[PDB]
Structures are given as C-alpha cells and as structure tokens.
Design a protein around this nucleic acid. Structure first.
Lengths: 95, 108, 33, 79, 96, 91, 82, 106, 93
DNA sequence: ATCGGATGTATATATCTGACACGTGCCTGGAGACTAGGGAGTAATCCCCTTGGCGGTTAAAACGCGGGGGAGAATCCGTACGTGCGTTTAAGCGGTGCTAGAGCTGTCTACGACCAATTGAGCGGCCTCGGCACCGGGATTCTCGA
DNA sequence: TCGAGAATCCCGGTGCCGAGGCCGCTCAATTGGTCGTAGACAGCTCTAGCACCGCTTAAACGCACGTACGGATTCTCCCCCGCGTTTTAACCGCCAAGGGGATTACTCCCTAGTCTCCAGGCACGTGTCAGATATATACATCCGAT
C-alpha cells in the first residue's frame, strides 16, 4: 500500500481521443507503460550527451529537438518535430 | 494557490510537471530549461497516439473491442518505421507475423 | 486524411502521417529463374 | 538430464513457428547446446544483479535488466 | 493418408497464428534451477522471473530458426542442418 | 594464382585502397544534398574513408562465407543481400 | 554542382577491397551492388554528422562530428580523438 | 613534505585525483565515495599494461623497436578476451588478420 | 591546455618493456581506449546505483560493474588488482 | 614423380631525414586541515509468497512401420571471368594567394534554482455488469485417388 | 475433371471474472517572490579551407584469348514424414510451514564545501637516430615438357 506511478491514465485519455469505442487490457497497458519509459530514457540520455559535448550545463528545447532528430526515423521525426514546436509555441503565449 | 496545470496551457494530455520532475532527478544535466518538458511530453504523446491508432485498427479487424498484446505486435511489425524503432525489443505474449517463404509454397 | 478524428477542437487527422510505409520482407531463393 | 526435458516435439513446434518445413535428425542436439549457452549467459548477469542487492531471491527486474544490458529489451514484465 | 509436407504447412500456419508458449513449463523450470546451481547455491526464484526467462528463450530460438531457414534455402535445399545454424550464428556475430 | 598472390599482398599491408580525391568529391556531393554551403576539415574526410573501407572489407568477408556455404567460389549479389539481411541491416 | 561521382569508385578499387577480404573470384554484377551499399552507408553517417554540426551553429564539419556519428551507430573508431 | 600524491599511497601510476575529478564532474551520481577512483584507476592501469605488453611482443616479432597501430591491431585481434571486449571497434591504420579459407587453398 | 593519459601510458610501457618506444598515432589509439573504458564502467556503475535507490558510487558498485563488463579471466585479474590497490590505500592514512 | 627455368621472394649495406624523446618555465589544479549534516548501516517486527507434498486425469511423449521424395553423386556443356599488353587519363605533388569563419575576451540581462503556503490531481480500495471464452450443430472449402 | 472425406468457418447459447467507474484523502505540483550566474552578443585576430596552375607518371581502360567453373540433367538410396498403440509425467486442486522481503526508528561517520599553498604536468625548443629507400644478390615456387 505505497504510491507507485505509471502512465496509465494518460494513455487511456489518448486512446479515447483516437478510438472512442475501444478498450484495453492490463497486459497491453503494461506494454505501453514500458514503451513510454524506454523512449523517455533514450531521448533524455541523448540530450544529456549533446549538452556535455558542447560544454553547456542546461537542457533546453533545442537539445530535445536535436535528439529527436537523431533518434527517430525520417517521417516520424518530421511529424514529432512539428508536434513539439506547436506545443511550445502554444505554451509560451499562454499565462 | 493552484490555478491551471501546465498541460492545459500547452494543450496536451501528458503531464508536463511530472516529466519536469523526472528530468530534474535523473542525473541528466545541472539545470533544466522551461520548454524541455513541454516539448518532450508532446513528442511522447504523439508516439503513443500513433501506436494506439494502428493497434485499434488491428483489433477492430478481428471483431474485438479490446486491445491485447497481439494487436500491439501486429501494429508494430507491419510498419517500416515503427519496426525500425523497436527492432531490438521483444513484446511478451505477442507472437510473430505470419509469413512463409514463397519457395516452400506449392504453385498451381 | 482519415486517420484519427479527434484532438480537442482539432483532430488527430492533420497530425498522424497518412501514408505509412509497409514493411517489406526478404525472399531468398527468388523463384524468378 | 534436465536438458532432455526440451523434447523433440517441442523443438519441432519451435521450428514450425519459425516457418521451417523439414528438419534434419541432428538438429535437436545443436538446439539444446545453443539454448544452454544462452541461458548461462543471461542467468550469470541476473545472479550478479541479485547478489549486489544482498538478496537471496531472483526477481523479475534482475532478468529484465540482464536482458536489457545485452540488447534484448523485453516489454511486459517491466512493472 | 496426406502426402508428406502438407501437415507441415498446416502446423506452420497454426503455430504462426497463436501466441502461447510451446515448451512445457515444469521441465524448463528444472533446467533453469540446475543451471543457476553453479553460480550460487541455494537460490530462490520469483515465478515471474522464470516466466520472463521462458519468454526470452522462446523469442530467441524462433528468430534463430528464421535465419537458419534462410541459410538452408540459399543453398537450394528445404531441410535445415546444423551447419546452417552455425553459419547463421557466425554471420550474426556470435560464433566468433 | 595471381588472385592468391593479391590476397596475401593486400592482407599484409595497411594502406588505404581508394583514391582520395574521388572519395572527397562524393562526400561533398552527398553533404550538399543534405545542407548547402558546407566545409570540411581534411581529417573529417580521412575518418570517413577509414570507416568506409573497414565496413566494406567486413561485408566482403561475410559475403565470402555465404558463397562458400552454397558450394561456389564466385561471390554474387545474392550473397551480399543474404549477409546484409542476416546481419540485421536490411530487415 | 557535382554528379555521377559514384563512378569515381572504380572497378579495380572494389577488386582491391575484395582481395583484402579474402575473395578469390568475383562476378560481374558486384560493382553496382557495392556502389549502392556504400552510398547508403555514407548517407546515414553524413546525415548524423551534419545534424551534430548544425546543432553547434557551425559551418564546417569537424572530425569530432564524424567520430560522434560513428559512435552513435555502433561503429566506434579509434585514432581521431575522442 | 606533505605532498604525497594519492596515487603514491595507492601504489599506482595512473592518476587518482584526476579520475576523482572526472567522476565528480561527469554527472554520474550525486555523491562519490573514497575508494571508487582508486579502484577504477587500478583497473584501467591493469588493462593498459595487458594490451601494451602484447603489443610490444608483436613489435619484437617484426624486428621493430616502436609500436605502430598495426601492432595494436595484431595484439588485439589474436587474443579472444580482448577481441570480445573490443568486438565492435575500428582501429585506424590497422589492417586485418591474414586468414584464407581452406577451400580456397590449392 | 588539453589533457590526456599519455605520460601514464608511457610509464606503464617502460614498466613492461624497458626498451620499447611508441609512435604518436598509437598513443592516440591508447588514449581513446582508456577514455572508452572509463565511460563504459562509470555509466554501468551509475545505472547500478540508480537501480537500488542510492546516491553514492562506492568501490562495491565499481566492482560489480567490472564483473558485468569484462569477460572471463580479465574480470578476475582486474578484481584482484583493484582490491589490492584499495586495501593498500586504506593501509596508509 | 622429375628437371629448366623464369619469375617473385627474402637476404645484405649506404645515406638521410624528420619525428620522437628529453630538458626548462610556470601556473593552475590537487593536497592538507577543518566543520557540518544527512545518507546509510543496524536491529526488530510483520506477513507474504516461495518451497514441498499428495492424489487423480488425461493429454502429450515415445515407439514402430511403411513409403516416397529429397539429398547426394556423376556427367556434360558453354560462357563468363582471369591474365596480359598497349594506349589514354587523371590523380598526386609543389607553389601562390585569398578570404571565411573558428576561437577567444569582455558586458550584461533574463532565466532557472530555491523556499514557503495552498490545494486539487492521482492513487488505492470496492463493486458490478458485459465482453470474451467455451460448446455444440450446421454449411463451406480444400486434398487427393481414380 | 470429379466426388469421398477430412478440415475449416459461422451461429447461437451459457456463464464468469476482469475492465471501468466511484469515492476518500494525502502529497506533489502550482503561485509568488528573491537572487545570482550562464549564455547571448559584439568585436577582434589569425588559421586553415578553398581555388588555380603546371608537370609527371602510375593507375585506369579497352581488347583478345582460353579455360575452368556454374548450371542443368539423370540416377540411386536412405532418412524423414504421416499414422496407429502404448506409456508416462505434466497439470490441477488443495493443504501446510517458514524464510526472506519490506518497513520503521536510531545513530554516527563519511563526504561536500572552504581556504591556503605548492608542485606536477602542459607548452615550447632542440638534438640525434630509427626507419625508409636505394642497390645488388640469393633462394623458393610454379608451370611446362617428360
């Protein structure tokens, strides 16, 4: 009986956005949780190495963008860059 | 006070604050900017939406209304770029794609 | 453009790539004589 | 023994899932040798991870980490 | 009586459609315990640990058999032989 | 005979085997296709050459193994494609 | 500005590369395959190197960019720094 | 007096203070112990000595008194442990190992 | 100022082969090798420390990382060398 | 199995040059000495989940038999590749000149760490109903001998 | 080509157990404000990357000849597949004991920070000798004629 966190509720929100009449089992959600953790770690590690190569001490959106370009294959990378840029632009104009 | 989440400002469904905390505690750099968690959460949400859309189509093809790991394997392995991203990853209880070499199959 | 049809006021149609590439399989001993 | 529990019909089924049509008679010994080598390689790292934490029980996460460090990431047991 | 090779194709399709585990659980568990006997004596295993080991082993063997099949076909045969396994493991980067 | 002599001669030495200037031109062409108005340090082109010869030599060893497996002495494109598929570069 | 430079990788050079690999007899179709394979390899490495260069807001590609690009893909190279 | 280096107390040649600095500044963990740089420096020096004496033997068999990259390649590729450790590493100006398959010999 | 491991490698070379020199290219190769192994071992030790929810890297993490990375007899000999160094270091001050 | 004999290979010595190895400043990074606080070792308790045993069922494994088709050899044909010679081309070396642009130093602000107060988001526990599994009967569809 | 007949697909009925909501409630994320330094930016210098010209000579290119290797065909025999019988051990339900894994409260000692000082390890010069290259010679090796 100790708090342990996971990405379940957010994955379910996205799923209701994409397919409004579909469910998911427990093991599939476990797979999805592991997938999100793995990708997060890859991107963050690449950004860390990028910052250390260029002698910086800050991880910015620029580092994440370059790491996303390095990691994902072509068309996925293009669309992911579009999504991230759109989100940052929308966030920085809102209070 | 607590007025508005950051994910509501960015128009996302993933947690910006939790991603910021995870970045700040994971020994990645000395300092972490303000737009890094937003950008990262947007990317993660995009990838999740892609996989879930393909898997939901695969589940609907089989007269089912609930996704199991077999549908995830079918979705991932039938796409060039997703199969390249997960090329060294095993999905438990997933099986394989049906394929038989053409030489083995009888002709006419 | 018919992949995903909801994301807030927008949809998930303009975001997801519309023509993903199918994965091609290597065939040895091509029966092409 | 205990490597003879990997019976001939089981190896035959594993070959069928991989798309094989005809199996020579000397395949089963090679398969048993390969499987034993793979298992030793993984279990050594799992036990190392166990001993570092001063435990006497091998958990799922030791197996997951041992597989991950050999470039064989496994999804499903990670939580 | 079916001609040789037909039931082989039926079994190929049947086992490529399903997702279960093909090795008996109890003999695999005994083999894992005996192998782990060498590195440290008097160990204990969570059940999910043994299940994870089984999943990894099945996946590895199936992929190896796919590469073996390609090597066998390349030499104008349909029967797989130990030397196909040896070539696949050598090129894949494991024999040497 | 002369083939075996060439094998021994080129396995004993360590120099590079492709002329430098054509390789430099090819590298500049591809980088042009990625980004315009780029410049290169000379050691960058030298590193690219070293890596490329290493890759091609290892690939040819795998191809030779594949050809011998099929009871031939001549290497053929099918052998290269099989080796690249088993290596995991293709699928 | 540049074109058909892939034909600057001549047939004798490919023969020499095969000889260092131990190949005794060569077909006549190997040369086109070798050119295609080399072009693909070069494209991947150069794309990574240019990404690394453009992140640092430079205009010349350095040796360290190539070294990092090779390291990222599992082709670690010794002798040019790093 | 009062200037004995940490390497001198450990009985090593590789630098312990420098390795401690690199561990502290490399963002590996929040804190770093006291015996970690010592133990790491000892391991690094051992590996260096192993590879260097193999390379020196390769150099004397060639009747040369200097070590060149070809000698390092020959030392590494002939030993199975080092060939496992450095299995995916390219050494510049190193060449290959002279091997011809037996079906090719006359 | 740019630092390297050149003088330490030269000292070890004079230890094992008293009458052998080394060229500059081979010294660059050796420097790259030392850096590569340093990064590998330190990263594995960091992962070990993070798995068990600790905040310190000690000699025990380095020992386990060495046993995970190096193959065969190399792991045994390296463990012996490092243990000898640590006990000698704690003996003096 | 045994000779010409022509070719390519491992044997000296001469000389010559540039790279390696060592010697001198100096300056900045590491060692000495000391203080403060939290990370980690240690004992104690709870209880969960791992190991072990027993009896019955029944599905899988093991064994034998017959036959066919696939691996292997042996033979023959022709065309693609290797070897060598003469002719054409472009790489490589040496030198001259001209800027882009990398690399460094000095200022200044805007941006992220940090701390205290506030509160709602997300996690654990409890229920319930419907999606999926299983079973039985009936039309389709694919092999295969005749 | 065509019907036995064996396997596969579809419809309907029954039940159960896990996915999806609901509800407390704590603790992590949000607000608001302070402060210090990390990058952004501007200017300056000087290195090294790019462009051009000339000459030489070794590599690339085209062509001809012939042989040996890849492929196709045919024959034989043996070993792997399909199927029926008999044996065995895996799976399942149930029960029982206790060994370690979590969790908590205490205590101390090991590691950041902070000054101060001094010596080790980079840059910069400089000399000399190992290795490369030339030149001539001796010996293995491979191919043709027996």
């Amino acid at each position: 009986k100790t708090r342990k966190e996971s990405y379940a509720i957010y994955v379910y929100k996205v799923l209701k956005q994409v397919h409004p009449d579909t469910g998911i089992s427990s093991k599939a959600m476990s797979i999805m949780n592991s997938f999100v953790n793995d990708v997060f770690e890859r991107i963050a590690g690449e950004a860390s190495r990028l910052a250390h190569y260029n002698k910086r001490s800050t991880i910015t959106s620029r580092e994440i963008q370059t790491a996303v370009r390095l990691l994902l294959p072509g068309e996925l990378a293009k669309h992911a860059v579009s999504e991230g840029t759109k989100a940052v632009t929308k966030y920085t104009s809102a209070k | 006070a607590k007025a508005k989440t950051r994910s509501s400002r960015a128009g996302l469904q993933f947690p910006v604050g939790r991603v910021h905390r995870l970045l700040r505690k994971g020994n990645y750099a000395e300092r972490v900017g303000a737009g890094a968690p937003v950008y990262l959460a947007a990317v993660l949400e995009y990838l999740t939406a892609e996989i879930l859309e393909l898997a939901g189509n695969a589940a609907r093809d089989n007269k089912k209304t609930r996704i199991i790991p077999r549908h995830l394997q079918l979705a991932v392995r039938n796409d060039e770029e997703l199969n390249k991203l997960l090329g060294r990853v095993t999905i438990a209880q997933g099986g394989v794609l049906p394929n038989i070499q053409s030489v083995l199959l009888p002709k006419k | 453009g018919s992949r995903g049809r909801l994301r807030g006021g927008l949809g998930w149609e303009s975001s997801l790539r519309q023509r993903p590439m199918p994965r091609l399989t290597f065939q040895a001993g091509d029966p092409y004589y | 023994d205990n490597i003879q529990g990997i019976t001939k019909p089981a190896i035959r089924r594993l070959a069928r899932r991989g798309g094989v049509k005809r199996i020579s008679g000397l395949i089963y010994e090679e398969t048993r040798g390969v499987l034993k080598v793979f298992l030793e390689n993984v279990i050594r790292d799992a036990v190392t991870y166990t001993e570092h934490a001063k435990r006497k029980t091998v958990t799922a996460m030791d197996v997951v980490y041992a597989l991950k460090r050999q470039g064989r990431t496994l999804y499903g047991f990670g939580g | 009586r079916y001609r040789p090779g037909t039931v082989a194709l039926r079994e190929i399709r049947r086992y490529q459609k399903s997702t279960e585990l093909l090795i008996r659980k109890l003999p695999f568990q005994r083999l894992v315990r005996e192998i782990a006997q060498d590195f440290k004596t008097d160990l204990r295993f969570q059940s999910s640990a043994v299940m994870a080991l089984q999943e990894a082993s099945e996946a590895y063997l199936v992929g190896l058999f796919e590469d073996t099949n390609l090597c066998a076909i390349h030499a104008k045969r349909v029967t797989i032989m130990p030397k196909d396994i040896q070539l696949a493991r050598r090129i894949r980067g494991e024999r040497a």
